[PDB]
Design a protein around this ligand. Structure first.
Ligand code: CLA
Ligand code: CLA
Ligand code: CLA
Ligand code: CLA
Ligand code: CLA
Ligand code: CLA
Ligand code: CLA
Ligand code: CLA
Ligand code: CLA
Ligand SMILES: CC1=C(/C=C/C(C)=C/C=C/C(C)=C/C=C/C=C(C)/C=C/C=C(C)/C=C/C2=C(C)CCCC2(C)C)C(C)(C)CCC1
Ligand code: SF4
Ligand SMILES: [Ca+2]
Lengths: 155, 80, 147, 202, 39, 219, 143, 146, 92, 74, 74
């Protein structure tokens, strides 16, 4: 009558099903998130991820900074976030051109885990596609944070 | 992996085969000692380099030597 | 099987971070490189020697250039006891209001740092007296480094 | 490709001469990808178009008496809102050009019309003459930009002064560019160094 | 410049050379090094 | 100067002892006769026969670097204090206060460090602040070297294994993966990195104090 | 042994709660090992990955990631419960490989059915010096 | 048709009455055939003259208005002494590398290089005695005065 | 039964405990807006070239640091400066 | 604010000391790197230079490392 | 009003306490190495704790690093 047990009836693996992971509220919520969605196209995945990140990478940068006390300059201090998401897109493309090397294809193991196919995000062109979507999404999210922070109304 | 060697000054006490924790050394028959058996090492690719065989060797100097070399996934003791 | 340690197939076939670190350690141990003869060893040493000479002459050329651009050499010659030598200028966007006001020394318009290498006394002793002789000699040292 | 830039230079392996304007000069191997060089080529030609139009765009106003020799917008009839409608009409036009270029390449058309041969002229020689004239205007527009060194002198006016004194009115001496001599010096010794390097490395 | 041409540098020299070797140069260096380290 | 000259002689003979012993006993010893067949820089020869930690000639040189740093630190402390007392016309200070180590610590390390640590206080800063900053920067590098010198590889190997499990069984971060397996630094590498951190801190701290204490109260 | 016992599935594995130290991404991407033995009764043993598990009667099969873990469990069962285990190495493709005991008697016996390898008929100390083996890629011991 | 030969001078430098045994026989091929020996000798000479430069520059200043600059003298002396210490450690390191990598005992048999190796215990033990003497007495005099 | 040799793609741990497959997330034609928008940077060399040309923004950005009025180029202050450093000499 | 900073310094050093000690206790029996650490004893040097090196892998060594961190905390 | 005895007593009691806690961490590992029989502990708290040791150590590791950055970087 314990809430903790192994996964698939085989306990010799490291992942032991604990309440946190087992939790249906956690299971369905994680699946709903834009990265775990496999059928949706990679460009689409990258845009959603980039929008959320580009928007959250502005506030902590515009409130605490070198020009956080200058009124109009403080709004203009959010550009750095754009430079940050630019550095993030560059390192993401660098990881894609090296993770799934041309020599190493699938990398083996089809993976069962209930009737469903391998995510195309792990391909060579799929990571570049994701890198694109993340770049447009981050640039657009930073621009939305800057536009919304001046017409937010009673912020 | 590491290179293990067994010299002719072996007495065949079978202590290195008992001290090896990865089943690298074995005892083959010989005609040069009182025990008529000498150690060997066929599974050299499974050598990890813990040097327990050298501590188990009773003759002076050691009849078995573990010369460390290149490292692989098996010789580095990686479980991931 | 990666290809970064080009001089060692053993480290090239390492599936861990040990390949990276060791790839920067045995990079000059030409005596223990894959497929190396005595003639190849001596020729490789003869090349690295020229590379060292080139970087040495380039370094001293850069010293002459920086002192000729921001150092107060002409001002130091007219008074070699009171004025202080200037190494180079300091450009730091991280500096504040008081750092810029306090780092300006030696009769300069911007923030600079005083030199402790003692090259001003050496150049003033050998004969360099103008701010142009250091310039022309710096380009000469860069030329000999290129050769 | 048989012509070659300086004397006899080994043409790069990637440039087989298939392109119509292959002079054999392509240093630092900036373009070597099969799908990348075609797009770069499309860039070079679009550049020539804007630059050729530009060279004769400043030539006309400069030749006659007028304002804007160096600075534009003396008066005009539309301020700021103009600039917004400029980017809007160009964005629509450019999106159509990109869509057309992707389909066939060498996009030469106005608005949305894949191929634009109104005049019914499109031979090989005309494709080539477009490139050579575009390269020339791209290198001539910089001299129009280099009016800074010559200061108040305009493009037609700079030519007039150079006609009055041909020795004391050039970039090497009359301009403040004393490094132009070092540019032509290294540009003259560079060829010999390439031939030297390739020859030595037998 | 004037009578000092031999290696005499323009005023916005460290304002455009320090932002270059302190961010652009180590970024391209680390990117090329990482791609060379991997296969 | 008699006692300091004897201290210099002590440092020279000890560094020479470590280096000469590591050079003569490089190709064999009674504890390990086939050392010449193991190369120049090996970790050890197991924990057998009593234990053979730091038995290669590389390890002997590694141990001699500390003694070289101590000897050069003693000769430079002597030079700087004798000239520091000669330049200010107080030559009778070092001659009567250099015989006891408390006098060394008080009149040399504590008195000449009054202007160095005052580079940046809550009342502003000055030209010496950069030296004051690097004076503490050297202390931090030195303390980080003590980590690689004291702690050995096995503890860190188990720690890295736990971090590997953490990254593999975590959501939304298991999508990425390392191209090369993460492993702890080797025994020889750990000695080299620790020595580099120790030498860098030892150099930066003294350069900061020397230039600041001299530049701060003189020309 | 007298014939390599082919590893077969559908073997009763021991009852064990879910552990945390075992079968990572390498156990699938590269290789992993598996140990089988025969138990005569019901006991509780200690796994080399965490807590304790019980011994299900009849055959027993366990899977691990390193050969040292299977060898550790092998020596524990041979010195504490007097059993005779045997383990295999399963590759990524699915190629099973017999590993211990290869000759099948035990690795500490003679059996007169194995040829010696990696042996030097000279004594240690009679090896030539590093200078002699220069640019030869070989070493004194290797020679 | 003029000049000297290094191998001939080394082979001719052997004292009679067996003071050094073979003398310097085979030392020419030992030095010329090895690179770590030449590197150790060069590092020893460079590390010694670097310290010589440091000791002569402060006592006999060679540059004008150098004695007035107090930070320059201190920084130059400290810099040259630390550089000399690192180079001196490298000389002995390469000597150990020479003994391990390229020292064949059959080539120079009974010479001074193989002869100093026969009493390495005597050399190391006497170095240990000198170091213990200086350490015990310098520390004792300092603590007594303290 | 706990281990299989042939169907090893399910007995070792090769699973997806958080992924569902569906061809729908975003509304109709919205995806088309983002498709055309992300088409240009879709390739590796394309994005690396984008950020390489966008890297020149730091160089140009520093030049337009006049609006920021960073201590660096505003001045060093002639009135108060450390030209009186040390007590032994007025300048040195 | 300084009390906040020093209190967080104290919490950090206490967590590192408890990390070293708890790791030593939980991995003193048998680790995934060395599966036979229980039979090796409690106070042992290492397990040879294999697996890249296994120096101070014993439970006693963790206490030795811990003692150092307790000094740094107190 | 005796600051010497006040500071002395506080410092002394703090050092004695820290030494004793490190000793507790030592003897727990001594027990786990010698007197731990995996027969009387099948599914109890000790067995479950030794079962998820990887999760425990990894979380303590992260907390340690977070506290170090946020408490020393300030
Ligand atoms: C190798 C010695 C050396 C060192 C340690 C430094 C260090 C420094 N330089 Mg300097 N520089 C040097 C040589 C050196 N320089 C030489 C030889 C030149 C003449 C070409 C210059 C020209 C120069 C300028 C104009 C500026 C600096 C600046 C700076 C500072 C900021 C960092 C930076 O932006 O890098 C420097 C960036 C560079 C691009 C210079 C690197 C020079 C390269 C390596 C050689 C270029 C080739 C050149 C055509 C000559 C051919 C010789 C070749 C074949 C070897 C920094 C303190 C900046 C500053 O803030 O001043 C305080 C600044 O604006 N440097
Ligand atoms: C080594 C060279 C170097 C250089 C040149 C700089 C330069 C700079 N650093 Mg820095 N830094 C460095 C090293 C360097 N750093 C290192 C080694 C560290 C680690 C200790 C740090 C850690 C550090 C921190 C923690 C911070 C800085 C900050 C800053 C900025 C100063 C504050 C400011 O005015 O904001 C800049 C104001 C601007 C208007 C600049 C905007 C231009 C940016 C650079 C690019 C944005 C354009 C964008 C990409 C447009 C995209 C185009 C689009 C069409 C695609 C400044 C530009 C501060 C900062 O970033 O401010 C928030 C700051 O917080 N640095
Ligand atoms: C008047 C008679 C005479 C005398 C006194 C000498 C004396 C000498 N001869 Mg000579 N010789 C002579 C006649 C004589 N010779 C004649 C008639 C001939 C024939 C022409 C030669 C031909 C000859 C040759 C060819 C050579 C000599 C050499 C030597 C020197 C070394 C001999 C030796 O054995 O090394 C000494 C014996 C040792 C065992 C060395 C001991 C090492 C000590 C113990 C080391 C202690 C160091 C320690 C750290 C010190 C601490 C001090 C601190 C400051 C560091 C020596 C000074 C050799 C030479 O030139 O060397 C300079 C040489 O090769 N002789
Ligand atoms: C923990 C240590 C620490 C902390 C907290 C800070 C904090 C700060 N520093 Mg700083 N700094 C540090 C160490 C630290 N520093 C060190 C060691 C150095 C020397 C190398 C410097 C050198 C330095 C300089 C030169 C400057 C700063 C500046 C700043 C301020 C703005 C910097 C910035 O870019 O904003 C923050 C940018 C971010 C991207 C923060 C990200 C926030 C993360 C994501 C946490 C929020 C989400 C969190 C995970 C919650 C989880 C949510 C859940 C759903 C998962 C800021 C308050 C600048 C300043 O002017 O100060 C006012 C500045 O110029 N620092
Ligand atoms: C002396 C300069 C020159 C030359 C020889 C050419 C030659 C050519 N151009 Mg061209 N062009 C030029 C300048 C030039 N152009 C300029 C200044 C512009 C800017 C308005 C253009 C814009 C342009 C367009 C839009 C097109 C051409 C096209 C062409 C090709 C066929 C049309 C024609 O005969 O004209 C011929 C291949 C057509 C083509 O498809 O190229 C293959 C095409 O439609 N050109
Ligand atoms: C004429 C000078 C000289 C030359 C040509 C050599 C040449 C050689 N040495 Mg040697 N050595 C020298 C001087 C020299 N050494 C000195 C002065 C020392 C005393 C410090 C040593 C001590 C030494 C040892 C102990 C060993 C060698 C070894 C070797 C051989 C290969 C290793 C190598 O070089 O790869 C290149 C090595 C590296 C790239 C490592 C660089 C990391 C450096 C040390 C740290 C830099 C400090 C820090 C990061 C600075 C930044 C500060 C920061 C604040 C910015 C090689 C033939 C090794 C050998 O024989 O093979 C087994 C060997 O183990 N050397
Ligand atoms: C190795 C370093 C060293 C040295 C050389 C000294 C030397 C000295 N110390 Mg000192 N000390 C040291 C370390 C050292 N100390 C340390 C490390 C400490 C800290 C613990 C101290 C703390 C200390 C204190 C507190 C004091 C000294 C004192 C003294 C002086 C005492 C003389 C004496 O003992 O009376 C004479 C001792 C004897 C006669 C012993 C008799 C032995 C037998 C019976 C006789 C020997 C045979 C005889 C000579 C016949 C032989 C025949 C022959 C001619 C053939 C002396 C000069 C005292 C002093 O007065 O300061 C000046 C004193 O106050 N020391
Ligand atoms: C209730 C208190 C207590 C008790 C009863 C024990 C009992 C035991 N401990 Mg233990 N321990 C304790 C507290 C305690 N410990 C604390 C507080 C610590 C943290 C420091 C430790 C850390 C510890 C370790 C690491 C080890 C033990 C071990 C042991 C066992 C054997 C110890 C031995 O052989 O003694 C031997 C007696 C000595 C070594 C004498 C101690 C000498 C000390 C180190 C000198 C201290 C200097 C002194 C304070 C000042 C002198 C100055 C000088 C000038 C004279 C034993 C059962 C050992 C074991 O194997 O367990 C099975 C083991 O290695 N303990
Ligand atoms: C000053 C020396 C020093 C330093 C800095 C550290 C630092 C660290 N030790 Mg450590 N240690 C030391 C000495 C030191 N140790 C010594 C002498 C010993 C022997 C007893 C040990 C024994 C020891 C053990 C046994 C353990 C540690 C652990 C740790 C880590 C815990 C991380 C943490 O929670 O805090 C935060 C970390 C830091 C504050 C590091 C400083 C980073 C600063 C803020 C720089 C910020 C980044 C900067 C801006 C970027 C630079 C830019 C550049 C790249 C251009 C940490 C990084 C534990 C560990 O592994 O972690 C779980 C561990 O178990 N240490
Ligand atoms: C005239 C004069 C004089 C005299 C002088 C003299 C007599 C001299 C000298 C000197 C010397 C006496 C010097 C020296 C030094 C030395 C050293 C510093 C050493 C070394 C060595 C080493 C380092 C080694 C190495 C090695 C090894 C280890 C082994 C083998 C190999 C080799 C070689 C590599 C006087 C002062 C009186 C007065 C004035 C003048
Ligand atoms: S160096 Fe490490 S592995 Fe080698 S003997 Fe010492 S503790 Fe053991
Ligand atoms: Ca002159």
């Amino acid at each position: 009558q314990q809430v903790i047990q192994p996964l698939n009836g085989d306990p010799f693996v490291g992942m032991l099903e604990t309440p946190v992971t087992s939790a249906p509220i956690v299971a369905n919520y994680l699946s709903n998130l834009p990265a775990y969605r496999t059928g949706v196209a990679p460009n689409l995945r990258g845009v959603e991820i980039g929008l959320a990140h580009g928007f959250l990478l502005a506030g902590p940068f515009i409130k605490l900074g070198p020009l956080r006390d200058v009124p109009g300059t403080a709004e203009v201090v959010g550009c750095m976030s754009a430079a940050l998401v630019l550095i993030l897109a560059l390192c993401l493309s660098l990881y894609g051109n090296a993770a799934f090397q041309n020599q190493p294809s699938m990398g083996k193991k089809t993976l069962s885990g209930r009737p469903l196919p391998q995510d195309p995000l792990m391909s060579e062109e799929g990571w570049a596609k994701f890198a694109a979507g993340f770049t447009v999404g981050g640039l657009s999210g930073v621009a939305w944070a800057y536009i919304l922070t001046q017409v937010c109304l009673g912020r | 992996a590491h290179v293990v060697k067994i010299y002719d000054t072996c007495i065949g006490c079978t202590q290195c085969v008992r001290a090896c924790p990865l089943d690298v050394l074995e005892m083959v028959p010989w005609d040069g000692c009182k025990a008529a058996q000498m150690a060997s090492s066929p599974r050299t690719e499974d050598c990890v380099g813990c040097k327990r065989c050298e501590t188990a060797c009773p003759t002076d100097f050691l009849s078995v030597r573990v010369y460390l070399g290149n490292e692989s996934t098996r010789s580095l003791g990686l479980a991931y | 099987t990666k290809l970064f340690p080009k001089f060692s197939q053993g480290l090239a076939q390492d599936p861990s971070t040990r390949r990276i670190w060791y790839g920067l350690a045995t990079a000059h141990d030409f005596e223990s490189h894959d497929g190396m003869t005595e003639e190849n060893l001596y020729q490789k040493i003869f090349a690295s020697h020229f590379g060292q000479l080139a970087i040495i002459f380039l370094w001293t050329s850069g010293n002459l250039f920086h002192v000729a651009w921001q150092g107060n050499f002409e001002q130091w010659v007219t008074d070699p006891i009171h004025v202080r030598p200037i190494a180079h200028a300091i450009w730091d966007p991280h500096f504040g209001q008081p750092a810029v006001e306090a780092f300006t020394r030696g009769g300069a318009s911007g923030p600079v740092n005083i030199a402790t290498s003692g090259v001003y006394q050496w150049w003033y002793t050998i004969g360099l007296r103008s701010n142009q002789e250091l310039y022309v000699s710096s380009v000469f040292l860069a030329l000999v480094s290129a050769v | 490709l048989p012509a070659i830039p300086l004397a006899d230079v080994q043409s790069l392996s990637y440039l087989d001469g298939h392109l119509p304007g292959d002079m054999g000069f392509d240093p630092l191997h900036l373009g070597s990808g099969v799908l990348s060089q075609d797009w770069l080529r499309y860039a070079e030609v679009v550049h020539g178009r804007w630059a050729m139009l530009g060279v004769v765009g400043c030539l006309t106003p400069e030749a006659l008496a007028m304002r804007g020799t160096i600075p534009p917008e003396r008066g005009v009839e539309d301020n700021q809102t103009l600039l917004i409608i400029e980017i809007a009409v160009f964005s629509f036009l450019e999106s159509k050009r990109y869509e057309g270029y992707k389909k066939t390449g060498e996009g030469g058309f106005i608005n949305s019309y894949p191929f634009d041969p109104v005049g019914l002229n499109s031979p090989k020689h005309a494709v080539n003459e477009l490139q050579q004239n575009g390269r020339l205007a791209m290198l001539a527009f910089l001299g129009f930009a280099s009016t800074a060194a010559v200061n108040g002198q305009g493009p037609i006016e700079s030519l007039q002064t150079h006609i009055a004194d041909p020795a004391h009115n050039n970039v090497f001496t009359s301009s403040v560019g004393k490094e132009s001599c070092v540019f032509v010096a290294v540009l003259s010794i560079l060829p010999m160094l390439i031939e030297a390097n390739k020859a030595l490395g037998k | 410049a004037t009578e000092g041409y031999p290696f005499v540098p323009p005023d916005w020299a460290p304002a455009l050379f320090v932002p270059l070797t302190g961010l652009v140069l180590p970024a391209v260096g680390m990117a090329w090094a990482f791609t060379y380290i991997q296969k | 100067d008699f006692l300091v000259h004897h201290a210099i002689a002590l440092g020279l003979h000890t560094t020479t002892l470590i280096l000469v012993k590591g050079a003569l006993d490089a190709r064999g010893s009674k504890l390990m006769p086939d050392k010449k067949d193991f190369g120049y820089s090996f970790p050890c020869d197991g924990p057998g026969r009593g234990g053979t930690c730091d038995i290669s000639a590389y390890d002997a040189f590694y141990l001699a670097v500390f003694w070289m740093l101590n000897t050069i630190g003693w000769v430079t402390f002597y030079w700087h204090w004798k000239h520091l007392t000669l330049w200010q016309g107080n030559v009778s200070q070092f001659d009567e206060s250099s015989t006891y180590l408390m006098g060394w610590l008080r009149d040399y390390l504590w008195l000449n460090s009054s202007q160095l640590i005052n580079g940046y206080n809550p009342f502003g800063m000055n030209s010496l602040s950069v030296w004051a900053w690097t004076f503490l920067f050297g202390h931090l590098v030195y303390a980080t070297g003590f980590m690689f010198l004291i702690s050995w590889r096995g503890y860190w190997q188990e720690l890295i294994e736990t971090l590997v499990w953490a990254h593999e069984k975590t959501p939304l971060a298991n999508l990425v993966y390392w191209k090369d397996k993460p492993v702890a630094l080797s025994i020889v590498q750990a000695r080299l990195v620790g020595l580099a951190h120790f030498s860098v801190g030892y150099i930066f701290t003294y350069a900061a104090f020397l230039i600041a204490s001299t530049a701060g109260r003189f020309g | 042994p007298w014939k390599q016992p082919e590893l077969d599935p559908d073997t009763p594995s021991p009852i064990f709660g879910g552990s945390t130290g075992g079968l990572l991404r390498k156990a699938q991407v590269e290789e992993f090992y598996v140990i089988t033995w025969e138990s005569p009764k019901e006991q509780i043993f200690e796994m080399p990955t965490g807590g304790a598990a019980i011994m299900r009667k009849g055959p027993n099969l366990l899977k691990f990631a390193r050969k040292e873990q299977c060898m550790a469990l092998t020596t524990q069962l041979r010195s504490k419960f007097r059993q005779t285990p045997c383990f295999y190495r399963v590759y990524a493709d699915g190629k099973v490989q017999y590993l211990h005991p290869k000759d099948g008697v035990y690795p500490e016996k003679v059996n007169a059915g194995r040829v010696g390898v990696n042996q030097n008929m000279r004594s240690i100390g009679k090896n030539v010096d590093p200078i002699k083996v220069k640019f030869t890629g070989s070493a004194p011991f290797e020679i | 048709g003029i000049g000297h030969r290094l191998e001939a001078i080394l082979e001719a430098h052997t004292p009679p009455a067996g003071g050094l045994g073979a003398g310097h026989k085979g030392l020419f091929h030992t030095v010329n055939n090895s690179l770590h020996f030449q590197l150790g000798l060069a590092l020893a000479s460079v590390g010694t003259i670097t310290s010589l430069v440091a000791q002569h520059m402060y006592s006999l200043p060679p540059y004008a208005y150098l004695a007035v600059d107090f930070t320059t003298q201190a920084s130059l002396y400290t810099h040259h002494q630390y550089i000399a210490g690192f180079i001196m450690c490298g000389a002995f390191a390469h000597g150990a590398i020479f003994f391990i990598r390229d020292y064949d005992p059959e080539q120079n048999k009974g010479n001074v290089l193989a002869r100093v190796l026969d009493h390495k215990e005597a050399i190391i033990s006497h170095l240990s005695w000198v170091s213990l003497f200086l350490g015990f007495h310098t520390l004792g005099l300092y603590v007594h005065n303290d | 039964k706990y281990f299989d040799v042939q169907d090893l793609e399910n007995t070792t741990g090769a699973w997806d405990l958080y992924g569902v497959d569906e061809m729908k997330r975003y509304p109709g034609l919205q995806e088309e807006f983002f498709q055309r928008a992300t088409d240009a940077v879709s390739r590796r060399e394309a994005l690396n070239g984008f950020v390489a040309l966008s890297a020149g923004v730091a160089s140009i950005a520093l030049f337009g640091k006049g609006a920021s009025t960073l201590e660096l180029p505003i001045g060093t202050k002639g009135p108060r400066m450390e030209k009186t450093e040390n007590g032994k000499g007025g300048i040195l | 604010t300084s009390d906040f900073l020093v209190h967080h310094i104290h919490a950090f050093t206490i967590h590192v000391t408890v990390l070293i000690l708890l790791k030593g206790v939980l991995f003193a029996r048998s680790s995934r790197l060395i599966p036979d650490k229980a039979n090796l004893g409690f106070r042992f040097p290492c397990d040879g230079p294999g697996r890249g090196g296994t120096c101070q892998v014993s439970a006693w060594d963790h206490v030795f490392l811990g003692l150092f961190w307790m000094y740094n905390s107190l | 009003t005796d600051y010497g005895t006040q500071l002395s007593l506080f410092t002394h009691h703090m050092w004695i306490g820290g030494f004793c806690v490190v000793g507790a961490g030592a003897h727990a590992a001594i027990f786990m190495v010698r007197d731990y029989d995996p027969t009387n502990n099948y599914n109890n708290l000790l067995d479950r704790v030794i079962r998820h040791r990887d999760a425990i150590i990894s979380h303590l590791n992260w907390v340690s690093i977070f506290l170090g950055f946020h408490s020393f970087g300030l």
